[PDB]
Design a protein around this ligand. Structure first.
Ligand SMILES: CCCCCCCC/C=C/CCCCCCCC(=O)O
Ligand SMILES: CCCCCCCC/C=C\CCCCCCCC(=O)O
Lengths: 176, 115, 121, 117, 116, 176
């Protein structure tokens, strides 16, 4: 009965890139096929001279058999009709690292505490998602207040991803 | 077989298992016919691509899908794929074996022709 | 929008039989089209050191799929040996991932070649 | 109470097995010299089977030496390398089946290990 | 200029193999490798200045590359202990030598560029 | 019967490097095992400031299965107790070409018409030759006057090489 067509999903109203900028710690992730970022994931969002959003994540990636490396990622966001939906073009400073171009949705945020992002990589023909990833971010790495957690769970439920998120560990594995 | 293909992984030190291989032959006008195709086995070899009969003369392209192999392992590789291009059987009977050694930013390719 | 001109693309060829720079080798470059055709892009021949410089500018070299085709067969025949390969193709995506310099290097033998890339952050 | 070490050698120039390439295998001792461990020559297909048996193939550092020089000199060329030299630790975690492979040219060789369980 | 140069490339990362330990030896009258020259690869993957025209004399040489140190310092478990390149040098007039090695965990190629 | 010990072979008395200099065409060759120079062989002999002899040579070499190339050879002669016997260090300008260090003997010469050279590369224990090469040179590529031919045949006989020399063809293969 729950509508699962990605085009039916609520996104952030009048999303404001400027209030979104700064550091965001990844607290939980729903992996897509061919998962990339493992753990220790921290993003830094900015706004351009021209008003364009961009970001610069850091994280542990488990390559090959068991080769672990700290990826420095970079992504640039082009706008759309909808202030909360972007196309994200991304690659790592090191070229052997994954490159790509993904829809990038701010499903919800209050700018100060939490954000829920979503990405649909592949569609089924009924409009439901065949391959997606989703991050939950927080401004504070230790966790979320109960009010925030409650909203977040509600958003996980609406993306048809309830109970599918892996917990993101932070143990200083990527320290300069 | 008239044509065997062996692929190796220079990184993990093993056969490249499940590498998709797509052989083409050259048409009278200058495009390619999908001549044969398969996947490398557990030993990384592709036997049973063609027969002496069908394996006529002309220009042939062996195309090895390396990108898929590497992406399936985290890495954004440099090459789309490997292409050995060679004339075959212009003096009757010969058994060709294309061998590829694979790395993300490099590959080497070799032919072992006999008869 | 005008910038300083150091080569986004360098080719280098080496003779594994003679232990020397593979001099005067025909190298052709193509970019895959909307219709999946290879469009002629750049052309030249390797110098005395075995290097093809100045093949294209930062600006003209744009996000795409590229084929570097090296005339190995020409080099080997013009020298006496009968090569196995018609040419050596190097197929690769470039500029999809920040501004970078690329280096193709090919190492030549009659029945064998190897290619390798050096891309710089 | 099938050999655990196979060597395949190829000719990058003529495009065929390197036939009659002399291969000499050494192992490392307490004091740091090399035991003549095994000996042979590449066959008609360039492979060296029956170099050794599972049990004698004990743990340690091993050197596979491939005589490239002879191969090339017997064909007119003054090659660059004395020989090809693969050095690896074998069996420090139970058994394992190694295949050292070498691609040959007068001024270049590449070498690679295909290890199996 | 330099009669001997070494160059190292990383086949996995598509870049100069920076800070690689390279050791050189000359075979002795008694079949012993005498320590000859030593160093580490620069930013570009290039060990220049290993020796001089005069000191580099007819003999057999072993260039040993510490591939294993490189790979472990990156967290991969390599197959090779090191990479040896053994060659006769300077027996055929005065020439410049270039060793180049291209590295992978379970594989490497070496090549020579000697100039007349 | 005939004494075939290399040390018993008569060489040129008071060989004069200077009268020997200039161009000599190779007219016949007895190949050693692992043969190198095929045909079209021409040598240029010189003498240095120091009095040391050296030479150059051009010639067709067949490499691999059937790769033909013009070799540009160079050799330096160090002297010995005997003015007709040298050690020849040699290599090609192209390094892939054969190098080495061979005894080099002037068995006989005229300076003006013919030279007969000999090299013993490997000995049997009774002092006889196990691997040798020998060259017959002439100042004129067209051939030898009958008086020179007679001596040359006689020298071939005494090096125990009668009937074993291959004719060297000169068809301009090495020009341009
Ligand atoms: C007898 C040597 C040839 C004539 C003297 C020329 C010396 C200068 C050239 C360098 C030496 C190259 C000759 C070595 C070839 C050995 C015999 C062979 O061809 O198989
Ligand atoms: C949504 C990711 C974090 C916010 C954007 C950070 C910008 C850094 C650039 C892109 C990082 C690449 C993320 C793509 C991988 C997502 C799925 C995965 O890791 O398996």
């Amino acid at each position: 009965e729950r509508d699962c067509r990605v085009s039916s999903f609520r996104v952030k109203e009048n999303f404001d890139k400027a209030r979104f900028s700064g550091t965001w710690y990844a607290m939980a992730k729903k992996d897509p096929e061919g998962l990339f970022l493992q753990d220790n994931i921290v993003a830094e969002f900015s706004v351009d001279e021209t008003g364009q959003m961009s970001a610069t994540a850091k994280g542990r990636v488990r390559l090959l058999n068991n080769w672990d490396v700290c990826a420095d990622m970079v992504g640039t966001f082009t706008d759309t009709e909808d202030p909360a939906k972007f196309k994200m073009k991304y690659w790592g400073v090191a070229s052997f690292l994954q490159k790509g171009n993904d829809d990038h949705w701010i499903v919800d945020t209050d700018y100060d505490t939490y954000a829920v992002q979503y990405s649909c990589r592949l569609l089924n023909l009924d409009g439901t998602c065949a391959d997606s990833y989703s991050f939950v971010f927080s401004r504070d790495p230790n966790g979320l207040p109960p009010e925030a957690q409650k909203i977040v769970r509600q958003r996980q439920e609406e993306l048809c991803l309830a109970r599918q998120y892996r917990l993101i560990v932070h143990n200083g594995y990527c320290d300069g | 077989c008239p044509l065997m293909v062996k692929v190796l992984d220079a990184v993990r030190g093993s056969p490249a298992i499940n590498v998709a291989v797509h052989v083409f032959r050259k048409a009278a006008d200058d495009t390619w016919e999908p001549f044969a195709s398969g996947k490398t086995s557990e030993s990384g070899e592709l036997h049973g691509l063609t027969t002496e009969e069908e394996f006529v003369e002309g220009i042939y392209k062996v195309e090895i899908d390396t990108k898929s192999y590497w992406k399936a392992l985290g890495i954004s590789p440099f090459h789309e794929h490997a292409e050995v291009v060679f004339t075959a059987n212009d003096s009757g009977p010969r058994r060709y074996t294309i061998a590829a050694l694979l790395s993300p930013y490099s590959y080497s390719t070799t032919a072992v022709v006999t008869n």
